[PDB]
Design a protein around this ligand. Sequence first.
Ligand SMILES: *C(=O)[C@@H](CC)[C@@H](CNS(=O)(=O)c1ccc(C)cc1)C(=O)O
Ligand SMILES: [Ca+2]
Length: 240
Amino acid sequence: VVGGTEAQRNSWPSQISLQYRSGSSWAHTCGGTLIRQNWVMTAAHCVDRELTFRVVVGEHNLNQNNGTEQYVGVQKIVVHPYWNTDDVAAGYDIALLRLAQSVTLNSYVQLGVLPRAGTILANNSPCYITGWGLTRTNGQLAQTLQQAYLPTVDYAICSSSSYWGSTVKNSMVCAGGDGVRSGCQGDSGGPLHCLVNGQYAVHGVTSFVSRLGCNVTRKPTVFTRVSAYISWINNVIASN
Ligand SMILES: *C(=O)[C@@H](CC)[C@@H](CNS(=O)(=O)c1ccc(C)cc1)C(=O)O
Ligand SMILES: [Ca+2]
């Protein structure tokens, strides 16, 4: 997250860290949202490589023991069947991870509330991106979880020629684009939390930023629109 602030450690209890095995240790690669005690929602592009993955829930600082973490292996990976690694702009950048063990819920570990199917936010709706992604374009991951206020940019504006044009689809949510705050590499997969009727709900799964950089004016961070995939998510959890 570029231009973020450090989140309080119990603000976003559904945020998870998706990590891969690297030698004798583990490395953060993406975020995710805990949606059941044994299921995580993340981006399909985060699980494209043939790596060994684990999920960390109750995480705040990646480089320090917080005394709240729970570590669980990924038992099954279900990518949307229409995802294509050669075309992130086509959409379908979503995947569900079945955890080997069910995690225990507490003030640091909670299920993410998902919007009702079909819900579209009005332009400029209040949202926060959260993650441990780079803190600057071509920078380094954050140690502590970060958050940034990214108001939505509706489809009409976001798919206009000066923004993302035809690259953005109506199955996506755009947010931000101010040139200062944005998602960045390593935030992908994680949540876009938006305040609706008093309650924050996870409306987006971080998917991409401009190839020019993370915080680029008129290139808002782009997310998979969760509310387009409610039936798909329910169908996967029910058949697995
Ligand atoms: C996600 O973080 C996204 C920017 C918000 C990235 C794409 N995903 S990533 O950094 O996790 C990634 C990059 C390259 C590879 C080979 C794998 C994963 C983006 O650049 O849009
Ligand atoms: Ca930690």
